[PDB]
Design a protein around this ligand. Structure first.
Ligand SMILES: OC[C@H]1O[C@@H](O[C@@H]2[C@@H](O)[C@H](O)O[C@H](CO)[C@H]2O)[C@H](O)[C@@H](O)[C@@H]1O
Length: 247
């Protein structure tokens, strides 16, 4: 039986410059869903994967951005992206969650992923307090990011967050090796892909790096899933073609 819980992170820069790249995807592999950090739909997907709209920040709560969220036929919707690094307090996000985001479950019967905070103390403390404030109306999924070089350390973090918040499944909305050594990137990617596949309470995980330009200095050139011409790397090929993954 083919395990399929691998999210295709499709950065909006792909939609802008290299639409045609989406047709070079392998859809007969472990690829399961798609997301693009936005409310709007990447048309080049042509509904070949379930799409998860995201309410990225306070700028996607009004106008056309909110209409995109209200009118979607897609089943699962993400809340804020790393709100702790954008001046959104747990008090704030909780009061938005109750007043407008809740309606998407109670009325439109959508499943809601929590805000995906970073795996640093500030992020862990932010989700801890938010989940507590909205405990009477909890999210359907716990959203996590993880970045580092030690695969054994990502596992303990997921095991640690599953222990702290045991009442729903986990989605890893972003993750990658930050290692500048490719064998250590390939090594980590392959380890956790195979590990998360056979962990029942991990619903889906989303490998970062599918975009032409480097997102920032923090992430690794060796962990890129798309070359500068829009073609796919070997890491991307294996990510979307191989289950189990292999080095
Ligand atoms: O096996 C999982 C771990 O893989 C590590 O990379 C390996 C290198 O340390 C080793 O020297 O070479 C092999 C390939 O021959 C690599 O797979 C990662 O550094 C770890 O993050 C990971 O847990």
């Amino acid at each position: 039986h083919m395990v399929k819980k691998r999210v295709l992170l499709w950065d909006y820069t792909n939609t802008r410059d290299v639409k045609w790249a989406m047709d070079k995807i392998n859809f007969k592999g472990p690829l399961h869903s798609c997301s693009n950090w936005n409310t709007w739909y990447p048309d080049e997907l042509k509904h070949r994967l379930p799409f998860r709209p995201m309410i990225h920040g306070k700028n996607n709560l009004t106008g056309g951005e909110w209409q995109n969220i209200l009118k979607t036929n897609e089943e699962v919707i993400h809340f804020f992206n790393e709100p702790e690094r954008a001046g959104i307090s747990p008090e704030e996000a909780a009061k938005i969650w109750n007043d407008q985001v809740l309606a998407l479950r109670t009325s439109h019967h959508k499943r809601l992923v929590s805000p995906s905070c970073a795996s640093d103390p500030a992020g862990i403390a932010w989700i801890k307090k938010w989940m507590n404030l909205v405990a009477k109306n909890p999210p359907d999924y716990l959203g996590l990011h993880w970045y580092g070089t030690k695969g054994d350390e990502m596992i303990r973090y997921l095991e640690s967050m599953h222990k702290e918040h045991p009442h729903q499944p986990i989605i890893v909305s972003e993750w990658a090796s930050t290692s500048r050594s490719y064998p250590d990137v390939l090594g980590l990617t392959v380890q956790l892909a195979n590990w998360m596949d056979s962990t029942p309470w991990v619903a889906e995980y989303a490998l970062f790096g599918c975009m032409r330009q480097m997102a920032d200095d923090f992430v690794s050139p060796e962990a890129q899933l798309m070359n500068k011409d829009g073609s796919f790397t070997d890491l991307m090929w294996k990510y979307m073609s191989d289950q189990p993954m292999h080095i």
